[PDB]
Ligand binder design. Structure first.
Ligand SMILES: CCCCCCCC/C=C/CCCCCCCC(=O)OC[C@H](O)CO
Ligand SMILES: CCCCCCCC/C=C/CCCCCCCC(=O)OC[C@H](O)CO
Ligand SMILES: CCCCCCCC/C=C/CCCCCCCC(=O)OC[C@H](O)CO
Ligand SMILES: CCCCCCCC/C=C/CCCCCCCC(=O)OC[C@H](O)CO
Ligand SMILES: CCCCCCCC/C=C/CCCCCCCC(=O)OC[C@H](O)CO
Ligand SMILES: CCCCCCCC/C=C/CCCCCCCC(=O)OC[C@H](O)CO
Ligand SMILES: CCCCCCCCCCCCCCC
Ligand SMILES: CCCCCCCCCCCCCCC
Ligand SMILES: CCCCCCCCCCCCCCC
Ligand SMILES: CCCCCCCCCCCCCCC
Lengths: 97, 97
């Protein structure tokens, strides 16, 4: 399986950066929630973003404990992004699932 | 830092399960997109879920390559969940960012 190996090996020095992509990718979602499409906030699941926040927090603690920035750097940024999603969903819906 | 250590150590045997939580947590978000609140799909960022899908796919390939189910199992389920988000956003908006 040359392709799987090629990609797998190529990702090795990029793993810390990889952890930053999804948190950074959440910025357009935050933009829609807070700025451009707040009237559609009810379409967002509070449950989903709460659990994202929870898991990101756990990985952050894990990574900090083991002095592994590849883990905690991306997940710390993630945690903040997903908490911002939680706050915004509550702010524009008054509460939902 | 006893608390950080306590949590960090406790998570060690749970890391595979941890990888399943966010994908499973996406189910209420998929429910809102497809079933209960499709009229608010424009509030979802296609860019965000596309990039989630992309990163999940990369981790899946990485985990498969290194025979590490703690990595690829959760990210494979994630990949499918986030692709489902992508498809649904396109289906109910006709395209957006
Ligand atoms: C605590 C964390 C909070 C901080 C993170 C929240 C970031 C919110 C904005 C991200 C910009 C990404 C989307 C780009 C928005 C560009 C705005 C603009 O240029 O105008 C609208 C544009 O035309 C669109 O169609
Ligand atoms: C007072 C603000 C201090 C922020 C430091 C928090 C530290 C924890 C990080 C959470 C990131 C997201 C924080 C939430 C961003 C606030 C957005 C907000 O509440 O806006 C509501 C809306 O504008 C009205 O309807
Ligand atoms: C364990 C990881 C998860 C941690 C999660 C951290 C966020 C906790 C919630 C903060 C809500 C603050 C939002 C304030 C919204 C402004 C007030 C408003 O507009 O109405 C909302 C009203 O309070 C309807 O309950
Ligand atoms: C390819 C991946 C696609 C498959 C994954 C997509 C899952 C979509 C539904 C998840 C259920 C979670 C939300 C629970 C919905 C319960 C429905 C119900 O009981 O009624 C509505 C309820 O009252 C609500 O308020
Ligand atoms: C024909 C279906 C076969 C599915 C196998 C795909 C394999 C890849 C996994 C992607 C998971 C999400 C797949 C997307 C689920 C389809 C939902 C859909 O298209 O619904 C549109 C809407 O109902 C109309 O407006
Ligand atoms: C690299 C990881 C990312 C991979 C991402 C995989 C998904 C690719 C998009 C499939 C769209 C299919 C959706 C079909 C929607 C039904 C038709 C419709 O309702 O209008 C949409 C129309 O095509 C407006 O473009
Ligand atoms: C493994 C997590 C699956 C999440 C499915 C639960 C959806 C129903 C909502 C109840 C939980 C809401 C409280 C926020 C955690
Ligand atoms: C003006 C409207 C005010 C809306 C509330 C602003 C304060 C929200 C702070 C959330 C902080 C969450 C981090 C724990
Ligand atoms: C590191 C990723 C940041 C994402 C910010 C880009 C938002 C603007 C939309 C352009 C990209 C849309 C194409 C889908 C990948
Ligand atoms: C009835 C409306 C049909 C809407 C399209 C259904 C097919 C979508 C398939 C998406 C598969 C994506 C995985 C690559």
């Amino acid at each position: 399986m040359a392709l799987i190996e090629r990609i797998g090996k190529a990702l090795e020095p990029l793993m810390l950066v990889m952890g930053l992509i999804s948190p950074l990718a959440t910025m357009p979602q935050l933009y829609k929630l807070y700025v451009s499409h707040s009237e559609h906030a009810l379409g967002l699941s509070l449950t989903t973003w709460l659990l994202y926040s929870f898991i990101a927090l756990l990985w952050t603690i894990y990574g900090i404990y083991h002095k592994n920035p590849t883990i905690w750097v991306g997940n710390c940024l993630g945690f903040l992004m997903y908490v911002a999603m939680v706050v915004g969903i509550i702010a524009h819906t008054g509460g939902t699932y």
